[PDB]
Amino acid sequence: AMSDSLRIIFAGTPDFAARHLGALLSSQHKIVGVFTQPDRPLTPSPVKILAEHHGIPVFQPKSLRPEENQHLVADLNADIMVVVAYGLILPAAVLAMPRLGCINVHGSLLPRWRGAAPIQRSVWAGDEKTGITIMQMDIGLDTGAMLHKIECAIQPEDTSATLYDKLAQLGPQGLLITLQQLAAGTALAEVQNETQATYAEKLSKEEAKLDWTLSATQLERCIRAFNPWPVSYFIVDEQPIKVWQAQVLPAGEDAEPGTIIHADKHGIQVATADGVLNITQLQPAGKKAMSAADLLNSRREWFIPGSQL
């Protein structure tokens, strides 16, 4: 039996959003206009490039709050607005306009990881599963009712980069399914449970410094979560050394956090609060990322056992 076609305004900025606009362009839905952030140092956003390529009208208001930028929305005559990593706020007046409202594709399984960095934070906290949630947008920050969710396992080697890639494929599927339910009137909205809510904070160069008072397993999560950016690091001999890969080894003899337990071709083993961090792939400033073997060959003195970082 026949599905239905909606007129849609799409609002998004980054690659994650462009992959959603791509699925929409391939669907039977009608994309009447695309909102995206103003060009920044000047570069057009991936969404803009994709929209222009397909000849869709692009709109780049600095703000949607001022009352007559709101006519941009009203004149497009849309059933719904789809919002993916747009980056500007939708005031109540705009949320109010589309016949079916505004929905958002969010990069976690809500209520968990509301906010700026849900993909990175889910890796960082060692969640077994993450996912995407299709949400009916409302006043608050990622507080809206949940229309649809799809799960994704976080694998042992998943970084923020590889998980981003998985969720960019999953999100468009969830969005398409949800659009069909909203067009047919079959959707079900689930209120978020506020006690399960957590916030996902942006990463910082400050936080990327390896903290030896955490457990080995937490640090290894950090190394994956902080890849591609900021990239976990530690300091030795007044030099920053980026850490790309590590492993988590069983607690041995007691030792003070930060102590080098062993250094060899195997890795560089560092004591933590709980268990041992074996650091297997490292990046000195100005050099290509290399094995422990490579770095120890050049700089053994940095890693003499019993020394503390």
How many residues in the shown chain lie near ligand MET by CB under 6 A? Answer: 8
How many CB atoms neighbour CB 208 within 10 A?
Answer: 22
Which range binds ligand MET by CB under 6 A, 64-72, 80-88, 158-166, 277-285?
Answer: 80-88
Q: CA 247, 152, 34, 75: dihedral to nearest 10 degrees?
A: -140
Q: Work out how close the CB of 60 gets to ligand MET at its nearest, in angstroms, rounded to a whole number.
A: 15
210 appears as a binding residue in the annotation:
no
- Residue of this chain nearest to ligand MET (CB atom): 106
* Discontinuities in the chain (C→N > 2.5 Å), after residue: 41
C-alpha to C-alpha distances, 102 to 147, 155, 250, nearest whole angstrom? 12, 33, 49
What is the DSSP pairing of strand 114-115 with strand 239-249? Answer: unpaired
Rounded to 5°, the CA angle 290-294-296 comes to 120
Among 87, 228, 252, 305, binds ligand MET (CB under 6 A): 87
Q: Work out how close the CB of 232 gets to ligand MET at its nearest, in angstroms, rounded to a whole number.
A: 24
Residues 109-148, one symbol each (x = binds ligand MET by CB under 6 A, - = not), give ------x--------------------------x------
Of the two residues 83 and 277, which places its CB atom closer to ligand MET in the complex? 83
Rounded to whole angstroms, the Cα distance separating 235 from 152 reads: 35
Among 35, 86, 226, 233, binds ligand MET (CB under 6 A): 86
Paired tokens of 1: 């039996």
Rounded to whole angstroms, the Cα distance separating 176 from 184 reads: 13
Instruction: Work out whether 95 is an interface residue with ligand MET (CB under 6 A).
Output: no
Q: Work out how close the CB of 158 gets to ligand MET at its nearest, in angstroms, rounded to a whole number.
A: 20
Which range binds ligand MET by CB under 6 A, 84-92, 188-196, 233-241, 288-296?
Answer: 84-92
Among 24, 73, 80, 83, binds ligand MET (CB under 6 A): 83
DSSP class per residue in 128-184? SEEEEEEEE--SSSS-SPEEEEEEEEPPTT--HHHHHHHHHHHHHHHHHHHHHHHHH
Rounded to whole angstroms, the Cα distance separating 218 from 212 reads: 10
Q: Work out how close the CB of 26 gets to ligand MET at its nearest, in angstroms, rounded to a whole number.
A: 22
109 appears as a binding residue in the annotation:
yes
Instruction: Work out whether 85 is an interface residue with ligand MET (CB under 6 A).
Output: yes
110 appears as a binding residue in the annotation:
yes
User: Is residue 220 classed as helix, strand or coil in its secondary structure?
Assistant: helix
Give contact residues for ligand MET (rule: CB under 6 A). 83, 85-87, 104, 106, 115, 142
Binding residues: 108-111
Residue ranges at the known binding site for (6S)-5,6,7,8-tetrahydrofolate = 108-111
